[PDB]
Design a protein around this ligand. Structure first.
Ligand SMILES: Nc1ncnc2c1ncn2[C@@H]1O[C@H](COP(=O)(O)OP(=O)(O)NP(=O)(O)O)[C@@H](O)[C@H]1O
Ligand SMILES: Nc1ncnc2c1ncn2[C@@H]1O[C@H](COP(=O)(O)OP(=O)(O)NP(=O)(O)O)[C@@H](O)[C@H]1O
Ligand SMILES: CS(=O)(=O)Nc1ccc(CC(=O)N2CCN(c3ccc(C#N)nn3)CC2)cc1
Ligand SMILES: CS(=O)(=O)Nc1ccc(CC(=O)N2CCN(c3ccc(C#N)nn3)CC2)cc1
Ligand SMILES: [Mg+2]
Ligand SMILES: [Mg+2]
Lengths: 352, 352
């Protein structure tokens, strides 16, 4: 059977697919036409139907996995479209994680003789994260940070070594937010979570602006001015609040200027999109900072698909974590940020 | 001069006024007509102009302050209307705190010979809180909690003794949120803050529902179902997430169901108001819980005017703090929750 790892989240399904590249002439004969059809379908297309996408730039080439060489592919589609995926599959050992491994268990079992093995969402995240970092991103660093995040003329993406990754605070920004403290490969805890996550950004953005997609929400936010909607320290004090080191530019009340009817009538959709992004991102950074201080961990890695093609939020996290921690915490980012659960599920295959 | 304490916040001005009740016959003669006019104006009206309100139920009767007996009155009006207040004053030693003591300093100085003494917002909060608790609420407890907050058939307001109040975590929910750790009467720190506060509730509520007042926002929220807008754990897992003790009813993504166009088209304004209230309140409780664990403090008192006439948020905080802390933290509430800064400012008068 094909080697697949699936993470069915509240919003997106993430799929890792291992394509063998060391197929012998004899093995090619013993391949059934459906298996050959699957491999060619997945490797000859980058869009699958109307909503599936292969993230070609993330492909790991010539990986040795389970004693065979191949390429590891990364594919995503909305959980709303899982019925289409299952229906395509009805006309294999599936290691699956995420909440949908439980919610849609009976649906996967409509595929005759399919064996479904449910694996824990956070166990898979930790295993997949450690694995991808260990094999590298085709010889490049999987982990990076923004150097000199305080100075914009100098702020630049730089590689970060995670050879001894422990301890590590993992902030998983998906529909909601989970925060993990990782002390060893077999010792980790879910410290807490917050419900102000990627789904809050997209849901509030759609309500406030009428945007119809995540990418559209980000494009609006890139054009907006969040201070048209937010009430800042300087709006309350006239300047800094010096006694407690709060700069005038800090947000005192997110959307707090929207209590005034005249300001609601002048704010643009782009301003509201940016205020939503800033509100959600700052809250995540602040919760991450409190968890790091309590866990006595100084390396904070942010994963999940809220940060896909979202440099605004990454730069805001990098700057805010460094600024508000007075340089004691560092924001770390991973190239394969949305796919670690799917990889960890795939890695569970030898157990079964 | 009249004895007044003023806290000029980002949204509301809070005023504490001490009315002497031991005026002798000779003192009444030496009272200038303007002073008599002020005292009679304040004590014979409960509404001042179109936006000032005296909270008569909070009055402290027959208090001994600065060696005189009198009644302590509590008055509020929007900071937007401070120009009207100052203009009324132009046709006294003023101890003032809050950001507006700085922002509007030059405006207060347009009142001839007025001496303005700016006092720190959080120093005044701590001093006023400790003072009011010490003198009691006309012989009743100033501090209360909700007993058996987990069981609704039993949940009831009960008094709480703060005779030895230290240590104490104070969560001040105003326009934004400040969190204080109080170790003694002269030893306290601002632990952190969040910008998701009362102004976020009111601003987002107005954008989403068109409500025109705080009280209207709360009335809408009392009629709504937040789960029409929020994505719950059971929407993602089909039930509880047992491995990490997350019940199916917990919110996984605030407004997370609003990523679906069909759900945006069926949600009511009341549902959105309630989802806004729940989102903001849960975030405040969660940040409070993390700060309490880090500060090693188990008593968490919530103040500020976000909780005025807001039993929904108080009960949600009481339940959530107890539930998510597994009974280790207790949510405490104070009858004079919005006025402690104004009282603390008044208490600074003997310094000058
Ligand atoms: N193409 C997209 N469609 C939808 N959401 C996207 C997309 N791209 C990025 N996002 C963001 O990614 C978030 C989902 O991230 P993801 O890590 O895949 O969550 P999930 O695993 O599906 N949810 P969860 O059950 O909470 O773990 C959304 O809330 C958006 O903020
Ligand atoms: N009549 C009202 N008008 C406006 N807001 C109200 C009213 N009643 C209650 N509120 C709530 O009270 C919050 C303001 O609380 P308050 O403690 O007075 O803040 P503030 O001191 O003015 N702000 P801050 O500068 O951050 O300390 C608002 O954000 C609302 O959520
Ligand atoms: C006194 S007031 O009247 O001006 N009102 C007032 C109320 C609340 C605030 C907010 C606040 O305190 N903060 C501090 C820490 N914050 C962050 C952000 C990102 C990261 C990361 N990574 N960490 N911490 C956010 C904002 C300010 C003023
Ligand atoms: C795994 S998932 O896919 O289901 N996604 C997922 C993501 C985030 C969450 C949220 C979460 O973890 N929590 C825990 C603690 N929370 C509170 C609330 C109030 C108080 C107080 N006082 N304290 N803590 C809020 C919600 C849940 C699921
Ligand atoms: Mg996920
Ligand atoms: Mg205040």
């Amino acid at each position: 059977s094909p080697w697949f790892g699936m993470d069915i989240g509240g919003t997106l399904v993430k799929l890792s697919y291992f394509e063998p590249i060391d197929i012998t002439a004899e093995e090619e004969q013993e391949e059934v036409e459906s298996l050959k059809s699957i491999r060619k379908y997945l490797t000859s297309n980058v869009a699958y139907g109307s909503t599936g996408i292969r993230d070609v730039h993330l492909e790991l080439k010539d990986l040795t996995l389970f004693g065979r060489r191949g390429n590891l592919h990364f594919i995503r589609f909305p959980t709303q479209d899982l019925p289409t995926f299952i229906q395509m599959g009805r006309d294999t050992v599936l290691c699956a994680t995420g909440g949908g491994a439980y919610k849609f268990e009976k649906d996967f079992r409509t595929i005759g003789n399919l064996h479904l093995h449910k694996l824990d969402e956070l166990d898979c995240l930790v295993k997949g994260l450690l694995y991808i970092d260990s094999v590298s991103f085709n010889g490049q660093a999987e982990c990076y940070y923004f150097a000199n995040a305080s100075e914009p003329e100098r702020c630049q993406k730089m590689p970060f070594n995670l050879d001894d990754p422990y301890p590590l605070l993992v902030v998983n920004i998906g529909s909601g937010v989970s925060i993990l403290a990782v002390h060893s490969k077999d010792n980790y805890k879910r410290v807490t979570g917050t419900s102000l996550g990627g789904g809050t950004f997209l849901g509030l953005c759609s309500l406030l602006t009428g945007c119809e997609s995540f990418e559209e929400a980000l494009e609006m936010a890139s054009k907006g001015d969040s201070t048209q909607a937010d009430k800042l320290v300087r709006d309350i004090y006239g300047g800094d609040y010096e006694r407690f080191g709060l700069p005038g530019w800090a947000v005192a009340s997110s959307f707090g200027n929207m209590i005034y009817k005249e300001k609601r009538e002048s704010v643009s959709k782009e301003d509201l999109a940016r205020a939503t992004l800033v509100t959600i991102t700052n809250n995540i950074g602040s919760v991450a900072r409190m968890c790091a201080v309590n866990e006595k961990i100084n390396r904070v890695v942010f994963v999940g698909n809220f940060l896909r093609v979202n440099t605004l939020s990454m730069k805001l996290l990098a700057y805010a974590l460094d600024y508000w921690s007075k340089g004691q915490l560092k924001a770390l980012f991973l190239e394969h940020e949305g796919y670690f659960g799917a990889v960890g599920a795939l890695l569970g295959l030898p157990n079964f």
